[PDB]
Amino acid sequence: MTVTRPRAERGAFPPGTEHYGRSLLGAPLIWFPAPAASRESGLILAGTHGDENSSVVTLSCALRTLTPSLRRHHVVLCVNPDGCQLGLRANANGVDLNRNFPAANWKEGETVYRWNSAAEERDVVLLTGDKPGSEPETQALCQLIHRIQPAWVVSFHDPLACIEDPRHSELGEWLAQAFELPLVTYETPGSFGSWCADLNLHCITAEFPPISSDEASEKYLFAMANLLRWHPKD
Amino acid sequence: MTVTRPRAERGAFPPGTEHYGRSLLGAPLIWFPAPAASRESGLILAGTHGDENSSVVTLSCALRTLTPSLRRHHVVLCVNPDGCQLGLRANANGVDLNRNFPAANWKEGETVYRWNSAAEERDVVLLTGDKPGSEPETQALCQLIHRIQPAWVVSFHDPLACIEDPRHSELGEWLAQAFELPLVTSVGYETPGSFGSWCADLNLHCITAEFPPISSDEASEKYLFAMANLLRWHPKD
Ligand SMILES: C[As](C)(=O)[O-]
Ligand SMILES: C[As](C)(=O)[O-]
Ligand SMILES: [Zn+2]
Numbered sequence: 001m002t003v004t005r006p007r008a009e010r011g012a013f014p015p016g017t018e019h020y021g022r023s024l025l026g027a028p029l030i031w032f033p034a035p036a037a038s039r040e041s042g043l044i045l046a047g048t049h050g051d052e053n054s055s056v057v058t059l060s061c062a063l064r065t066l067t068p069s070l071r072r073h074h075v076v077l078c079v080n081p082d083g084c085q086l087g088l089r090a091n092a093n094g095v096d097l098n099r100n101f102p103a104a105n106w107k108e109g110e111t112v113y114r115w116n117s118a119a120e121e122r123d124v125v126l127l128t129g130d131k132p133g134s135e136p137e138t139q140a141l142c143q144l145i146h147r148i149q150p151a152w153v154v155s156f157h158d159p160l161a162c163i164e165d166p167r168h169s170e171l172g173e174w175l176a177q178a179f180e181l182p183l184v185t186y187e188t189p190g191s192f193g194s195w196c197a198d199l200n201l202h203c204i205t206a207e208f209p210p211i212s213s214d215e216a217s218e219k220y221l222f223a224m225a226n227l228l229r230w231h232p233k234d
Numbered sequence: 235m236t237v238t239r240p241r242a243e244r245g246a247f248p249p250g251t252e253h254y255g256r257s258l259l260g261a262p263l264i265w266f267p268a269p270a271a272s273r274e275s276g277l278i279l280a281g282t283h284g285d286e287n288s289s290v291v292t293l294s295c296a297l298r299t300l301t302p303s304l305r306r307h308h309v310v311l312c313v314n315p316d317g318c319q320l321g322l323r324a325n326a327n328g329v330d331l332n333r334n335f336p337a338a339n340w341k342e343g344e345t346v347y348r349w350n351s352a353a354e355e356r357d358v359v360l361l362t363g364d365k366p367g368s369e370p371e372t373q374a375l376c377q378l379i380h381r382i383q384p385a386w387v388v389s390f391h392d393p394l395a396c397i398e399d400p401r402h403s404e405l406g407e408w409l410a411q412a413f414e415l416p417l418v419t420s421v422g423y424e425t426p427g428s429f430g431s432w433c434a435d436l437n438l439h440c441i442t443a444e445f446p447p448i449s450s451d452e453a454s455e456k457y458l459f460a461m462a463n464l465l466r467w468h469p470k471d
């Protein structure tokens with residue numbers, strides 16, 4: 001009946017969850033199949049990086065806020081659940097998963113990244129994997145996308161405050177309006193966006209700003225929930 | 235000879251990780267035993283609630299920063315690894331793990347938390363377990379703390395911005411000063427089956443350190459000093 005479930009009921013997910021694999025350490029890889037599924041259904045995902053959690057919690061809350069039958073798009077809350085309980089960027093093998101996809105530009109070697117926003121120089125080192133798509137997490141996500149074939153992917157990260165949509169599109173600016181973030185128009189080797197580029201899978205990286213889970217779950221709750229509900233207003 | 239590992243290599247964990255069990259969904263329960271544990275060795279805890287992320291990244295950063303030799307205290311980054319992955323406060327059973335401890339004051343049925351700091355009341359319903367200490371995450375931690383017998387426990391949460399020391403002791407006043415958070419004895423509401431409630435019945439000193447609302451990006455900046463010093467904390471002498 002209502003657009004949203006009463007707050008008193010939002011402690012738990014609506015029943016429906018499936019598993020799409022297992023993490024390196026044995027935690028399930030989880031995804032939430034859209035109830036209103038169709039060929040227009042996109043894939044919304046988060047937590048590729050274990051320390052990027054404002055977007056994980058906000059999407060979880062949105063999932064638990066929007067009445068099920070209104071959700072059009074498939075959701076993965078956390079791509080990297082090991083890195084996530086270890087509060088770190090990489091998975092459990094030290095691999096920057098977003099340098100591990102079996103894209104055409106997957107170079108093997110080392111990657112580096114910034115300590116925080118106040119970090120200035122990308123010095124903190126990680127690896128890229130042994131072979132392309134080497135990690136369990138990478139394959140599972142890739143296999144999940146090939147099976148369901150989303151019309152588009154929106155990949156949440158942080159803390160750059162913007163929407164990155166190389167297509168310049170209706171979604172990428174719906175996203176700009178509703179999250180009040182600037183829009184901006186993939187070469188990052190072995191990243192998710194390069195791998196989608198190869199397939200002409202539309203991929204928008206949704207870069208949260210540095211924000212608490214406590215603020216985001218209020219500030220960004222509605223924009224997120226509307227994202228699960230989105231359709232080109234035509 | 236440095237107090238901290240070089241920023242360039244803080245991407246991995248220093249050796250000596252162990253498992254003290256399995257989450258409901260099958261993830262490992264992971265802990266980081268203190269290098270040379272002594273009678274002084276205490277316990278530093280995080281991620282009891284899976285959406286209270288900013289301390290689990292902060293503690294993971296501190297653990298990955300401070301030079302390993304200098305660590306005095308045991309560490310659990312994530313009590314509820316199914317919680318953290320699901321961006322949820324409860325575990326995979328809709329149980330509030332901090333109402334699930336086999337303390338004497340454990341009560342069956344429902345518990346309610348605050349949606350967020352914006353919400354005017356506590357009305358979001360969770361479960362307390364179908365029995366005292368029902369949940370695997372809860373049992374595993376309870377047995378860990380029996381095996382190791384810590385000097386004390388600091389458990390980090392979100393987002394009440396304060397240090398809750400029921401004893402008002404030194405560590406409590408250290409924590410208050412080091413993290414620039416007020417020192418208080420309680421969250422002015424009742425929490426049956428809470429971890430601290432279980433600790434009090436064992437006469438184990440538990441301190442809950444509540445972060446304020448703060449991103450993992452600024453907490454990895456603003457509080458890394460304090461967290462790192464907590465891993466090597468000793469009384470005044
Ligand atoms: C710096 As990136 C493309 O790994 O979010
Ligand atoms: C409700 As509490 C003391 O676990 O923040
Ligand atoms: Zn990132």
Ligand SMILES: [Zn+2]
Pocket residue numbers: 283286391392393
């Ligand atoms: Zn709490």
